[PDB]
């Protein structure tokens, strides 16, 4: 049963979905469920089911599979050449995760302020909620050497739409009561470059990509705005003008600007796409020529294991290796979602005044 | 030459294809600010005026074969807050520059530009209200690769539509990128000369055409696709066998059995 | 090389940039060149490249030409049987140019006025500005028996980009301070059929277009406000209520609607597009059915020189005679600018109240 490779399009919508941790995987031993590491068996790249031995197309999501496909495979695709991807793929899994217990660590503390200590908070400003950052996902890849990206995927039922849900209760209230966040960013960029360090986070080396070349485990990193507290000149007032996200990202409830957070974990920023726009969804802050380069190994995998021909009729012009060339010239289209390239033009407070440090997050008037 | 039949023409929306499926395709990213005014004349030493931004797209000429476009911006609007495209003139550009186009920022990286044709519209009210409909329009250029005669290897073709003005056109008032979210029409001038998947090929290998066009890289080949040739010899094939075979369903004949046996054997 | 007739459409379109003074026209003297006159070789017509010998498609805007392509030509086209369209073609372009000058002349005198002087007149009222109209465009075939049209034709670079700029500038400025100016129509039908006419201006006789029948040369008409002024109720309050443009053409900055001028040059109002509309685009008062009138003679040259079946294939039903008939019919519409047609509906102040005279531009408060 002859198989060809998949097209153009359907890798670039693999990497994609890597970044969101949400390629669909199928192993011999776990089946379509990826909660517990194995070596992929198939992939289901934009639509095709692929085989991860020969990286043919065997069937396609219309029909469902229980087995990897009988066919005619060249098993020359080995799983170092296509790790990149599932690393790539398994750690944003692990990531979102982590994210999300976090979001949730906020919200709940946030929405338990007593009705007083809040009101103090708006009058004259201050701490109203703190998070011991060691408290922050301990066991994961990102804050623990025992750890591992191969670990088991903590179960979480409607991970999208807990993160979409909390995310906006704990920013509706942070908006509502004018309360500023030491844990968001106007532009996630700064944080690789920009941001000014302080403590052990000036020795913070960000790969800025999720790749199994420089350590995750890392500390979690905030704003440090205590000597903005001490000025005399920013008090309370100074705060609800320039301070709060609403005047920098525009009021949470009405606006399409997606907000970002500083790195909480993985030293990679969050970015989390404007509430009207649909839903509030989660990417991490990777520039679209660092996804690509996952499939670098692969297409020399390819060119070495395919027919010229064959791959010259999937992959299109200068056949894979054309392919990745030209996708590589296209990254800031084809491989960004849409919610990184949706900041505010203007901004106010900005993300330079105060110091990032490895420290506790919180929320304060 | 001899694998080619006479072709037939394809409709797109160079607007809506997407680049990572329409191979033929370049354009300026967004986000970037990116907004450059420049001047280019037509063949007559007229000059013209139009802007390039985050989100223009152009054709790259380039590995096409002979190729006559036609453009209908009939019933697009157009219209913004301070441009109304009654009266306003579009036309197609070709450029030719070494430096790749995604890449342009600045009017310095353009090359050699000339607006090769243009129409002036004639806009009215749709059925939808507040929007304008632009009459239906025919602008035309013929890619004829012998007339360009590309010598300079690092030299890329480029086919862009947009608004080109006798005056400066103010940046904030006509914000579109281009006005290639019309209808294109694309006619192969060339039956001798084949592509795949966006670029020409000197010879094909009919059998690696099997099973490797996905449906949208089918829809986004080009009029002289060898996909779209191979369909064309096959439904004679498909047109021969109706005439011969009665079957119903799941009924075997002279015709399916071949099939059979590849099956049997597989 | 056989050759065509043009389609009906392309000569329509020919008349249509005749009036705005751009047809592009070669010679093998000045090449495509028009600046000095010589009798046209080829014209473009809608896209078709023409022989002006035997009005035939001789080539197209996509392929360069550098002479006239060498073709089959029955060389029956006098230079008599379209020069009415190269005349008018000619006469717009010395039109604008002259229109153009006068525009900046305005332009730099407001924007010079001095600050005082500004408010003095915003206060108060009184004269701000005044042109010497034996200034305004002194040696064109418009203000001296000595210019032709056939004369050279002033060379100006970004014709059109000025006359956008410099009018927009100008009339920003006259409707900041809601002055008002003596050189500005509500309905141009009003010049020729409309105001009352004193002094020499009364002999003024309008052709309503630009043809070789009719004197082109006369003065620099505008209103004379000075019984306005006079006037007691009618005071700078009054102004700024109803004279002041504003009022009757809506504020300049926030308009579709067109404003035109008084007969400036050639016995001709010029009409300009609103500012919201793109640009401002400046084109002549003339009639469609006016305007269709220069290819009269054209059709009778053509019916005389060309094969009946051939004019019928390429002109349409009735030939071209008979094309000639159905764009009379569709002159309102074909043959007719946008702008000409964009003026505003209410209009308070208006154009009949006070005279129009041979005198000096002038804007006042
Ligand atoms: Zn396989
Ligand atoms: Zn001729």
């Given at each position: 049963m002859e198989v060809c490779l998949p097209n153009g399009h359907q890798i670039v919508d693999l990497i994609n979905n890597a970044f969101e941790g949400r390629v669909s995987i199928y192993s011999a031993q776990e089946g379509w469920d990826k909660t517990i590491s194995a070596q992929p068996d198939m992939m289901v790249c934009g639509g095709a089911v692929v085989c991860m031995h020969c990286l043919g197309v065997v069937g396609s999501l219309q029909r469902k599979l229980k087995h990897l496909p009988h066919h005619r495979c060249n098993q020359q695709i080995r799983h170092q050449d296509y790790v990149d991807v599932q690393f790539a793929d398994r750690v944003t899994a692990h990531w979102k995760r982590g994210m999300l217990s976090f979001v949730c660590q906020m919200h709940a503390m946030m929405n338990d302020v007593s009705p007083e200590d809040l009101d103090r908070v708006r009058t004259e400003g201050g701490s109203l909620v703190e998070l011991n950052w060691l408290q922050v996902d301990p066991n994961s890849m990102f804050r623990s050497i025992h750890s591992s990206w191969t670990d088991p995927l903590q179960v979480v039922d409607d991970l999208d739409t807990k993160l979409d849900q909390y995310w906006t209760a704990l920013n509706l209230m942070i908006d509502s009561s004018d309360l500023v966040p030491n844990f968001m960013m106007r532009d996630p960029s700064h944080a690789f470059n920009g941001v000014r360090l302080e403590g052990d986070a000036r020795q913070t080396q960000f790969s800025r990509t999720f790749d199994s070349r420089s350590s995750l485990e890392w500390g979690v990193m905030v704003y440090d705005y205590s000597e903005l507290e001490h000025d005399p000149s920013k008090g309370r007032a100074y705060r609800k003008e320039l301070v709060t996200p609403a005047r920098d990202f525009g009021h949470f409830g009405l606006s399409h600007y997606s907000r970002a957070t500083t790195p909480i974990l993985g030293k990679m920023p969050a970015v989390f796409s404007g509430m009207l726009t649909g839903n509030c969804k989660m990417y991490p802050f990777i520039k679209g020529t660092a996804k690509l380069k996952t499939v670098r190994k692969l297409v020399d995998s390819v060119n070495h294991a395919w027919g010229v021909e064959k791959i010259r009729y999937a992959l299109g012009p200068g056949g894979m290796t054309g392919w990745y060339n030209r996708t590589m010239q296209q990254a800031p289209i084809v491989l960004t979602p849409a919610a990184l390239t949706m900041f505010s033009d203007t901004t106010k407070f900005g993300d330079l005044d105060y110091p990032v440090m490895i420290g506790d997050p919180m929320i304060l008037g | 030459p001899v694998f080619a039949i006479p072709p037939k023409p394809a409709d797109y929306n160079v607007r809506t294809l997407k680049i990572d499926e329409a191979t033929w395709l370049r354009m300026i990213p967004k986000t970037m600010g990116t907004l450059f005014q420049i001047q280019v004349t037509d063949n007559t030493g007229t000059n013209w005026h139009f802007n390039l931004r985050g989100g223009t797209r152009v054709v790259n000429?380039?590995?096409?074969?002979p190729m006559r476009f036609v453009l209908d911006l009939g019933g697009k609007s157009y219209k913004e807050t301070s441009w109304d495209p009654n009266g306003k003139k579009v036309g197609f550009i070709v450029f030719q520059s070494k430096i790749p186009f995604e890449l342009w920022t600045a009017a310095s990286q353009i090359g050699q530009a000339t607006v090769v044709n243009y129409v002036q519209l004639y806009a009215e009210d749709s059925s939808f209200t507040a929007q304008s409909i632009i009459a239906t329009t025919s602008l035309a250029y013929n890619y004829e690769p012998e007339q360009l005669n590309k010598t300079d290897p690092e030299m890329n073709y480029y086919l862009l539509a947009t608004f080109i003005d006798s005056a400066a056109i103010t940046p904030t008032n006509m914000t579109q990128p281009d006005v290639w979210d019309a209808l294109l029409t694309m006619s192969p001038l060339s039956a001798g000369e084949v592509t795949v998947k966006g670029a020409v090929v000197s010879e094909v290998v009919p059998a690696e055409l099997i099973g490797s066009y996905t449906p949208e890289s089918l829809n986004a080949s080009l009029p002289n696709d060898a996909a779209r040739c191979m369909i064309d010899r096959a439904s004679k094939i498909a047109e021969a066998i109706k005439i011969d075979d009665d079957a119903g369903p799941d009924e075997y004949s002279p015709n399916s059995v071949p099939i059979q046996g590849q099956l049997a054997i597989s």
């Open positions: - | 000429l380039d590995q096409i074969a």
